[PDB]
Amino acid sequence: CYCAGWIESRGTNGAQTASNVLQWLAAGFSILLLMFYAYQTWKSTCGWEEIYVCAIEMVKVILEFFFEFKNPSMLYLATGHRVQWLRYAEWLLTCPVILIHLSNLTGLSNDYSRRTMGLLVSDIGTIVWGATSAMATGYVKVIFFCLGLCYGANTFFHAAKAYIEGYHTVPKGRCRQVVTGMAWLFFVSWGMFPILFILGPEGFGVLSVYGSTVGHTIIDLMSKNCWGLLGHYLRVLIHEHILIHG
Amino acid sequence: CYCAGWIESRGTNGAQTASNVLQWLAAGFSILLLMFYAYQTWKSTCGWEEIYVCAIEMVKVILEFFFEFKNPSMLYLATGHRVQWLRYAEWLLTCPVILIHLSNLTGLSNDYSRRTMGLLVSDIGTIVWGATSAMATGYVKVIFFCLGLCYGANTFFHAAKAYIEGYHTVPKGRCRQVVTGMAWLFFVSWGMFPILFILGPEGFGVLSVYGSTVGHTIIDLMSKNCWGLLGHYLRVLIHEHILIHG
Ligand SMILES: CCCCCCCC/C=C/CCCCCCCC(=O)O[C@@H](COC(=O)CCCCCCCCCCCCCCCCC)COP(=O)(O)OCCN
Numbered sequence: 001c002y003c004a005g006w007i008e009s010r011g012t013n014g015a016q017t018a019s020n021v022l023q024w025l026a027a028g029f030s031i032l033l034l035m036f037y038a039y040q041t042w043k044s045t046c047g048w049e050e051i052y053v054c055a056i057e058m059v060k061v062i063l064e065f066f067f068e069f070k071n072p073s074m075l076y077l078a079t080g081h082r083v084q085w086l087r088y089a090e091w092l093l094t095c096p097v098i099l100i101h102l103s104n105l106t107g108l109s110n111d112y113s114r115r116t117m118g119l120l121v122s123d124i125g126t127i128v129w130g131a132t133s134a135m136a137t138g139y140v141k142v143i144f145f146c147l148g149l150c151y152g153a154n155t156f157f158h159a160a161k162a163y164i165e166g167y168h169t170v171p172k173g174r175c176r177q178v179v180t181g182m183a184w185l186f187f188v189s190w191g192m193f194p195i196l197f198i199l200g201p202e203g204f205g206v207l208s209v210y211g212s213t214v215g216h217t218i219i220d221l222m223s224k225n226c227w228g229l230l231g232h233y234l235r236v237l238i239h240e241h242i243l244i245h246g
Numbered sequence: 247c248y249c250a251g252w253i254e255s256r257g258t259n260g261a262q263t264a265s266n267v268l269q270w271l272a273a274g275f276s277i278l279l280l281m282f283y284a285y286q287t288w289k290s291t292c293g294w295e296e297i298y299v300c301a302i303e304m305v306k307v308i309l310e311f312f313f314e315f316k317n318p319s320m321l322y323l324a325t326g327h328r329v330q331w332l333r334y335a336e337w338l339l340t341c342p343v344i345l346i347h348l349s350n351l352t353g354l355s356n357d358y359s360r361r362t363m364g365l366l367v368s369d370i371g372t373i374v375w376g377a378t379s380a381m382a383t384g385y386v387k388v389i390f391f392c393l394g395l396c397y398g399a400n401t402f403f404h405a406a407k408a409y410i411e412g413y414h415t416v417p418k419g420r421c422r423q424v425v426t427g428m429a430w431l432f433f434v435s436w437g438m439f440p441i442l443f444i445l446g447p448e449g450f451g452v453l454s455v456y457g458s459t460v461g462h463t464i465i466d467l468m469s470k471n472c473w474g475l476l477g478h479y480l481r482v483l484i485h486e487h488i489l490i491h492g
C-alpha cells in the first residue's frame with residue numbers, strides 16, 4: 001500500500017510544536033478536572049455528564065499525543081485522504097453527553113423530554129454525516145457536509161431552545177450569567193467545528209493536519225472542559241440555592 | 247494506491263446473488279412499510295421512531311445495492327482492511343432511535359428517564375468501539391472489540407430492564423405477547439451483530455464481504471423493519487386499549 005497521498009506533510013514543525021503543547025495543556029486540564037470532579041463526588045454534588053466528558057477527553061488527548069497518526073486514530077483510505085477517526089469517535093462519545101447535560105441544566109429533573117431525544121438524534125446524525133463527509137472525497141463530501149449542516153442546524157435550533165429554557169428555569173443572578181456563558185461557549189465552539197472542517201484537510205486543505213489539530217484542541221478545551229466546568233459550577237450554584245431557599 | 251488487500255474477493259458469486267436478492271427484499275419491505283407508516287400517520291397514530299428507522303434503512307439498502315464497495319460506504323484503509331462504514335453509520339443512525347423506541351414502548355409517556363440516557367450513551371459507545379475495532383486491525387482490534395463488548399453488555403442490561411418495564415406497564419393480553427416478541431427479535435438480532443462481527447471480515451475472515459452482507463441484511467430486516475413493525479403494532483394496540491378502556 002503506497003498511496004502517495006498518505007505521506008504528504010502534517011505540518012510545519014511549528015504547528016506540530018503548538019499541537020503538542022496544546023495536547024499537554026489539555027491533558028493537564030482534563031486530569032486536574034478529573035481530580036476536582038472526584039473530590040466533588042466525594043464531598044459535594046457532581047453530575048455524571050461532566051465526569052464522563054472529562055474522562056473521554058483525557059483518553060482522547062492521550063491517544064492524540066501518542067498515536068494520532070496511527071491507523072485506529074487516523075484512517076488513511078484508498079482515496080489518499082487521512083481521516084481523523086479519533087476526532088469523530090470522540091465527538092460521538094462526548095457531544096451526545098454534552099447535549100444530555102444541556103437538557104436538565106439544573107441537575108434536578110430526573111426525566112427528559114422528547115426535545116432531548118430530537119437533540120440527540122440530530123447530533124448523532126450530524127456527527128455521522130461529518131465523518132462520512134471526511135471520508136467521502138469529492139461531491140459526495142459536499143453532499144454529506146450539507147446533510148450534516150442540515151442536521152446541525154436542527155441540533156443548533158434545539159440547543160438554543162434548551163438554552164433559553166435553562167436560562168429561564170435557572171435562578172436569577174449568577175446562575176443566568178453562567179448559563180449565558182455556557183451558551184456562548186457552546187455555540188462558538190460548535191460553530192467552529194464545521195468551520196474547522198471546512199478549513200481542515202477534510203475540506204479545503206488550508207489548515208493542514210497539525211493546524212487543524214491545534215484548532216480542534218483549542219475548541220475541544222472550550223466545548224468540553226470549560227463548558228463542563230461551567231455546567232458543574234451551575235449545578236453547584238443550583239444546589240446552594242436549593243439548600244438555602246428551596 | 248495499490249494495497250493488494252483491497253482487491254481480494256468479496257464473495258463466491260452465489261453469496262453475491264443472495265446479497266442482491268436480500269437487498270431487493272429489504273428495499274421492498276422498507277418501501278412498503280414506509281407507505282404503511284405514511285397511511286397510519288394520515289389515519290391512525292404513528293410514532294416517529296419507526297418511520298425514521300424505516301427511512302434510514304431504505305436509504306441504507308439503496309446505497310448498499312448501488313455503492314456498497316465504493317469509498318463512502320466502504321473505507322479501504324492503508325492496512326488492507328475494507329471497512330463497511332455504511333453499516334456502522336446506519337447503526338449510529340438507527341440503533342439509538344431503536345432504543346428511544348424501546349424506552350416509552352407505549353407511545354404515551356412524553357418524558358424519558360435517566361435509564362434511557364444511559365442506554366443511549368452505552369449504545370453510541372458500543373457502536374463507536376465496534377467501528378474502531380473494524381478499523382483497528384490487530385490487538386487494538388481485540389481491545390476495541392472488548393470495549394464494545396463491555397459497552398454492549400451495559401446496553402443489553404439496560405435494554406432488558408426496559409423490556410421488563412414495558413412488559414409490565416403494557417396491558418395484559420396481546421400487548422405482552424407483542425412485547426415478548428419484540429424482546430426476542432431485539433436480543434437475537436443485537437446479539438448476532440457481534441457474532442457477525444466476529445465471523446465477518448472485520449474479525450475472523452470466515453464470512454467474506456458478501457456473506458457478511460447477507461447475514462447483516464437478514465438481521466437488519468429483523469432488528470429494524472420487523473422490530474419497528476411490531477413496535478407500531480404494540481402502539482396501535484395500546485391506542486385501541488386507551489380508546490376502549492382508558
Ligand atoms: C458537532 C459535530 C460537528 C460536525 C461538523 C460537520 C457538521 C456541520 C454542522 C455542524 C453545525 C452546523 C450548524 C450551522 C447552522 C446553524 C444555524 C442555526 O440553526 O441557528 C440556530 C441557533 O444556533 C446559533 O448558533 C445561532 C445563535 C443564536 C442562539 C443564541 C441565543 C439562544 C440561546 C441563548 C440562551 C441565553 C439567553 C436566553 C434568553 C436571553 C434573554 C431572554 C437557530 O436557533 P434559534 O436561535 O432560532 O432558536 C430559537 C430562538 N429563536
Ligand SMILES: CCCCCCCC/C=C/CCCCCCCC(=O)O[C@@H](COC(=O)CCCCCCCCCCCCCCCCC)COP(=O)(O)OCCN
Pocket residue numbers: 337341372373375376391394395396397398399400402403404405406407409410413425426429433436437439440443
Ligand atoms: C449494536 C451494535 C453492535 C456492535 C458490534 C460490536 C460490539 C459488540 C457488543 C454488542 C453487544 C454485546 C453484548 C454481549 C454481552 C451481553 C450480555 C448481557 O449483558 O446480558 C444482559 C441482557 O440479557 C440478554 O441478552 C437477554 C435478556 C433476557 C430477556 C429479559 C428482558 C425481556 C423481557 C420481556 C419479556 C420477559 C418477561 C418479563 C417479566 C415476566 C414476568 C415476571 C443481562 O441483562 P439481565 O438479563 O441481567 O437484565 C436484568 C434482568 N434480570
